[PDB]
Amino acid sequence: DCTMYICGDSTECSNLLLQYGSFCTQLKRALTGIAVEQDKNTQEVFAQVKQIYKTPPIKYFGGFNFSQILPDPSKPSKRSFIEDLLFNKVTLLICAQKFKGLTVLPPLLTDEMIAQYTSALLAGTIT
Amino acid sequence: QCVNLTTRTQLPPAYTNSFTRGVYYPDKVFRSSVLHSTQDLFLPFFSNVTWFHVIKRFDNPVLPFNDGVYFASIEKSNIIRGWIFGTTLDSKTQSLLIVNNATNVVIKVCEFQFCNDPFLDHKNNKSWMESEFRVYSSANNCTFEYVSQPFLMDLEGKQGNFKNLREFVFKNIDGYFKIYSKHTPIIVREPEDLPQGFSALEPLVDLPIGINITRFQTLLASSSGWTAGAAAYYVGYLQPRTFLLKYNENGTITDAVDCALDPLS
Amino acid sequence: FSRLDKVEAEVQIDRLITGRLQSLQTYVTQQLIRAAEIRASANLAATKM
Amino acid sequence: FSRLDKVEAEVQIDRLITGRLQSLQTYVTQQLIRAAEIRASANLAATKM
Amino acid sequence: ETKCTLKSFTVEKGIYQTSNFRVQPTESIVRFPNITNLCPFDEVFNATRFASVYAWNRKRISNCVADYSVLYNLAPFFTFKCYGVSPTKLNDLCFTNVYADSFVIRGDEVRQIAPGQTGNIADYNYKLPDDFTGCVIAWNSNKLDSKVSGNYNYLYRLFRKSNLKPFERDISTEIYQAGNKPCNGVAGFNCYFPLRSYSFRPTYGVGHQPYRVVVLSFELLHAPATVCGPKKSTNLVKNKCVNFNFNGLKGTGVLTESNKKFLPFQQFGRDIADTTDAVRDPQTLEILDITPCSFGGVSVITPGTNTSNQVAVLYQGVNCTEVPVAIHADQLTPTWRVYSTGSNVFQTRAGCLIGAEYVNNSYECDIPIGAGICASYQT
Amino acid sequence: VYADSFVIRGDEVRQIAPGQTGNIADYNYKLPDDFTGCVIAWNSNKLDS
Numbered sequence A: 001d002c003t004m005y006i007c008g009d010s011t012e013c014s015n016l017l018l019q020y021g022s023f024c025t026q027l028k029r030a031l032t033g034i035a036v037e038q039d040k041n042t043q044e045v046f047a048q049v050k051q052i053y054k055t056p057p058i059k060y061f062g063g064f065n066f067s068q069i070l071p072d073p074s075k076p077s078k079r080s081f082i083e084d085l086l087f088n089k090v091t092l093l094i095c096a097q098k099f100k101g102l103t104v105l106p107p108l109l110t111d112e113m114i115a116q117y118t119s120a121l122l123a124g125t126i127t
Numbered sequence B: 001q002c003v004n005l006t007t008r009t010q011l012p013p014a015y016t017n018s019f020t021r022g023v024y025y026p027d028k029v030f031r032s033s034v035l036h037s038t039q040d041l042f043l044p045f046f047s048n049v050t051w052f053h054v055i056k057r058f059d060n061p062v063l064p065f066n067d068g069v070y071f072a073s074i075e076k077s078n079i080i081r082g083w084i085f086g087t088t089l090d091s092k093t094q095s096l097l098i099v100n101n102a103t104n105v106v107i108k109v110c111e112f113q114f115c116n117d118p119f120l121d122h123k124n125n126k127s128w129m130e131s132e133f134r135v136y137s138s139a140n141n142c143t144f145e146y147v148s149q150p151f152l153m154d155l156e157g158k159q160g161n162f163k164n165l166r167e168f169v170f171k172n173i174d175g176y177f178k179i180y181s182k183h184t185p186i187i188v189r190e191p192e193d194l195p196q197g198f199s200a201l202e203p204l205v206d207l208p209i210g211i212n213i214t215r216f217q218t219l220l221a222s223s224s225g226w227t228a229g230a231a232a233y234y235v236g237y238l239q240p241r242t243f244l245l246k247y248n249e250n251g252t253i254t255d256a257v258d259c260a261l262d263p264l265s
Numbered sequence C, D: 001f002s003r004l005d006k007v008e009a010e011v012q013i014d015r016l017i018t019g020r021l022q023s024l025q026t027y028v029t030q031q032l033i034r035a036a037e038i039r040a041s042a043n044l045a046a047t048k049m
Numbered sequence E: 001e002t003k004c005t006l007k008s009f010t011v012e013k014g015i016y017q018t019s020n021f022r023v024q025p026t027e028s029i030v031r032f033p034n035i036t037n038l039c040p041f042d043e044v045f046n047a048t049r050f051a052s053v054y055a056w057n058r059k060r061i062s063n064c065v066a067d068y069s070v071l072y073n074l075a076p077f078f079t080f081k082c083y084g085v086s087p088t089k090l091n092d093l094c095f096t097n098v099y100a101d102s103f104v105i106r107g108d109e110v111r112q113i114a115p116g117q118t119g120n121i122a123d124y125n126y127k128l129p130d131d132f133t134g135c136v137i138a139w140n141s142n143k144l145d146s147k148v149s150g151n152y153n154y155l156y157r158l159f160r161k162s163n164l165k166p167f168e169r170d171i172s173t174e175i176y177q178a179g180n181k182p183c184n185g186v187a188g189f190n191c192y193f194p195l196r197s198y199s200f201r202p203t204y205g206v207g208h209q210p211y212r213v214v215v216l217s218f219e220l221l222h223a224p225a226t227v228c229g230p231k232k233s234t235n236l237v238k239n240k241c242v243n244f245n246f247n248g249l250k251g252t253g254v255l256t257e258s259n260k261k262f263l264p265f266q267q268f269g270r271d272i273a274d275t276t277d278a279v280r281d282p283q284t285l286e287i288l289d290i291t292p293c294s295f296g297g298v299s300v301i302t303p304g305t306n307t308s309n310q311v312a313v314l315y316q317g318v319n320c321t322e323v324p325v326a327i328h329a330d331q332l333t334p335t336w337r338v339y340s341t342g343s344n345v346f347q348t349r350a351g352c353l354i355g356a357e358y359v360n361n362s363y364e365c366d367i368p369i370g371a372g373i374c375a376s377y378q379t
Numbered sequence F: 001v002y003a004d005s006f007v008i009r010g011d012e013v014r015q016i017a018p019g020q021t022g023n024i025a026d027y028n029y030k031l032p033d034d035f036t037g038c039v040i041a042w043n044s045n046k047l048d049s
C-alpha cells in the first residue's frame, strides 16, 4: 500500500506525502509486473500439453510397478505418495500476522489443477 | 538510644560464584513462546558474590551501593529484618528505612539521625525481642511513608536445617525504586553456597521516592550477652549488559542466556 | 504533534517519511533481483521438461 | 534564491539536488536490470540463430 | 476511476487496480481503573474548629485523589477562587504536594490573604509568596463557631518588629519593645503585647462575622506527581470498530473475547512483530483481544471500452459478511455506492466479487481473477 | 585572528548578519557569504551618548 505503510491513518502526513510525486505509483507498477511474471512462470512450465490425458484402470506395465508415482484416489486429493511426502516435508499465522497493508495475493493456479497437469504428463509419457 | 558492644573478629568476606541467579522481568508485557533480546543492568553470569556468615558472630558493616544490588539469604529462622539506604546516613538528607518486623511492611523516607550499630538482635536471655528499636534518634521531616502487609516468615529466632531461600534485587532509577522478590523453600543440601538451578525473579512493588543514595547497610533483629543461631547471606553487584530470554507458552520466563561470556554465547 | 509545534514537527515527519520510503525502495530492489534469479531457474526447468 | 538569504536557501537546494540525484539513480538501476534481461534474451536468440 | 488512473479516455478489456478500501471508526471509548483513596479534605472541611492565623494550621496532602468536582459543589460556600490557574481544570492537574492553610478570621480582612497586599495577618502572622499559584475558599462559619455568650478564644498578632517570610509560623509573643526604654517583668509603661484576642459572636456588624478560609498550595513538576482529580471512563463496546484508550493505549480496532492466560502483574500483550494485540481491562479483570480494522485493495473488471460500459468490482481479501458495513453511506472509502449494492454476490478465495453470476460450465480464461476463478463477458 | 570594532544603531544590528542586505550593508560594511566567527554587541549609551 502507498500510504498505509508509511504513515497510515494520518491526515497531515497524508497531505505532506502526496507532494513527493509518483513514487508509490511505480512501486505498485513494479510489484504488479512481478506478480504477473510469477503467474506466467508456472504457465510456461506446466502448460506444455493441451489435452488432459488419463491412465487406464488396468495397471500391468510389463512388470514395472508405477504405483508410487501414479495418483491414488484414497486421499481426497488426486495426489501420489511422493507428492504427499514432498508436501509434508515443507513447512513455512505467518500468512496473516503481516497486517501493515502487506497483502499476499493467491496464485492463479491452485494445487489441484497443477496435480492434474502432472497426472496428464505422467499418463502421456507412460502410454 | 543505642548501645555498642562490637569486639568481633573481622574474617575476610567470603567469595562464591553466582551460578545463574539474578534474572528478572524487565517490563509488564506478555509474550508467548518467543525469544527476545534486550539490554539492561544485570548481574553477570559467574561473578564473584560476597558471602557473609553470621551466627557470638556479628557481621554487618557498611556496604557500597551502585547500580542497585542483588541480595540473597539462605536461612530458616528469618533473623534479618530491615534495610537502611542513604547517601550520608547522618540525617543531613532523607534516607530509606524498610522494616517488616511483626506489624506491617513499612517504608519511610526521612532524615532520621541514626546510630553506629543498628541492632535489635541481642535479647536476654533465650529468645528475641525487638528491644532498643531506637536505631534512629530523631524524626525531622518525613516526606513519604508507605504501609502494607508483612511478608511470609516464621516466628522467633532459632537455628538448624536451613530451608528457606529469599532473594531480592534493589534498583533505583529515574527517582523510582524497584524491589524484586522471590522465595523458595525446601533446600536439601547446604554447602553454605548458592544452589544450582534456574528461577526468574518477579516484580513486587514500585516506590516514587526520588532521593540521592550512595551506600547501604542491612538490619537484623539487653545488648550484652548472646550467641545467635547460624545464618548466611549474599551480596552481588550489577552492570549493564545484554541478554536473551525465552518466554514459554504460559507467559513466564523459563531460560536466559548471556551474550558477552563465551564465543558460544 | 502533541509535544512539538505545528510548523516545525514537519522536519521529524519528513525524516521518518524519507527513511521508510528508502526502506521500501530497498525491499523492492531485492525483490526484483530475486525475481530475475527465479526467472532464470524457471527457464532452466522449462527446458528440462 | 530570489526571496531568501543564501545561508538558509542553500540547505533547501541541497535537499532538492539530493532528491533529483536519487531519482536518477533509481532510473539507472532499472535500466541496468532491463539491460541484463535483454542480454539474456539476446544470447538465447544468438543460440537459436 | 480506471479512466482517471490510466490517464486515458479509453480502457482496454481486462483487470485493473484502483485506490484502497478502509473502514472508519464508529465511536470512541476510554477506560481507567477504579477511583479510590480519596484525598482526606472531607475531614478538614468538616472539622470542628480551625486555629488562629499566627497558629495557622498547615496540613500536608499527597498520594490520593482530589475530587475537585465535589469541592466545587459544597452547599455552605461563600467564596471559591483560584488566582493562579483556572479552577475548572483542576480535575486534570497533578501536583506532587498539597499544603492546606486553614483558619477562621474576620470577614473584613480576607482579601489581605491575596499576595502583594498588606495586613496584620499578612505582615505579622502569615503572608504568601508573590508568585503564589494556588486557590482560596472562604465560607460563612459564624453559624456554628459564633455564640452570643462570647467567643474570645480566637487570637491574632497585632504588633511585631518585622514581616515574616512566606511559610513562617511563630509561637513566641515576647513583650514588645518599641522605643529606647527597657521593659521586662509584667505589664507597665510602653509594654504592649504583640497579639490581641478576637471576639466572634453573631451580633456584631454584618461582614465582621467570622469566616472560615482554606488556602491550597502546590508544587509544579520537580518530583513524582502525587494528587489530582479522577479521570472519567465510559462503558465498554464489543465487536465493532472503535477508538480505544486503556491507560494511554491509543489505537484503533475491534475488541473481542480472549482465551489465553496472563499473569497477575502482566498487563499488555505483544507478538513477534512487537505490536499491541491483547489487553486487560483495568476496572474488571478479564482479557480482551484486539484485531485491526478490515481493509484491502479494490479492483475493477471491465470489457473493452467500446464493447460495453458495465463493470464488476472485486474487493481483495475481505470476508464478505463485513462488506455490508461497506454497503453504507459515507462509511466505506470508495464513493461509488451504486455498485456497493448490485447483482448476486459471489464468494471466492480472494474476496467476494460484485457484478457477476457464477455459472458452472467450462470455458477458457479471459480475465484472470485468481484461485481457479476466471471471468469474462458473455451471454 | 582579526577583530573589527565600531558603533552602530541598536535598531540596525539585524543587517550586520550576512545574507541579508541594507544601507549599512551596502554603503558602510558587509560580511562575506560564509563568514566564520562571532559577533558581540552591547549598549554603550551610558558612556557614548
Ligand SMILES: *[C@@H]1O[C@H](CO)[C@@H](O[C@@H]2O[C@H](CO)[C@@H](O)[C@H](O)[C@H]2NC(C)=O)[C@H](O)[C@H]1NC(C)=O
Binding pocket: A065, A066, A067, A068
Ligand atoms: C507396487 O508396489 C507397492 C508398494 O510400493 C505394492 O503395494 C504393496 O502391496 C502389498 C500386498 O499387495 C501390501 O502388503 C503393501 O502394504 C503394499 N505397499 C504399500 C506401500 O501400500 C504393490 O503391490 C506393488 N504392485 C506391483 C504390481 O508390483
Ligand SMILES: *[C@@H]1O[C@H](CO)[C@@H](O[C@@H]2O[C@H](CO)[C@@H](O)[C@H](O)[C@H]2NC(C)=O)[C@H](O)[C@H]1NC(C)=O
Binding pocket: E034, E282, E283, E284
Ligand atoms: C471497581 O468498582 C466497581 C464498583 O464499585 C466494582 O464493581 C463490582 O462488580 C461486580 C460484578 O458485577 C459486582 O458483583 C460487585 O458488587 C461490584 N462492586 C461494587 C458495586 O461495589 C468492581 O469490582 C471494582 N473493581 C476493582 C478491581 O476494584
Ligand SMILES: *[C@@H]1O[C@H](CO)[C@@H](O)[C@H](O)[C@H]1NC(C)=O
Binding pocket: E304, E305, E306, E307, E308
Ligand atoms: C472500439 O472498441 C472495439 C472493441 O470493443 C474495437 O473493435 C474498435 O476498434 C474500437 N474503436 C476505436 C479504437 O476507434
Ligand SMILES: *[C@@H]1O[C@H](CO)[C@@H](O)[C@H](O)[C@H]1NC(C)=O
Binding pocket: E319, E320, E321, E347
Ligand atoms: C465470513 O465470516 C463468517 C463469520 O466469521 C463466516 O460464517 C463466513 O463463512 C465467512 N466467509 C467466508 C469464509 O467466505
Ligand SMILES: *[C@@H]1O[C@H](CO)[C@@H](O)[C@H](O)[C@H]1NC(C)=O
Binding pocket: E360
Ligand atoms: C451447477 O449449478 C446449478 C445451479 O446452482 C446446480 O443445480 C448444479 O448442480 C451445478 N452443477 C455442478 C456440477 O456443480
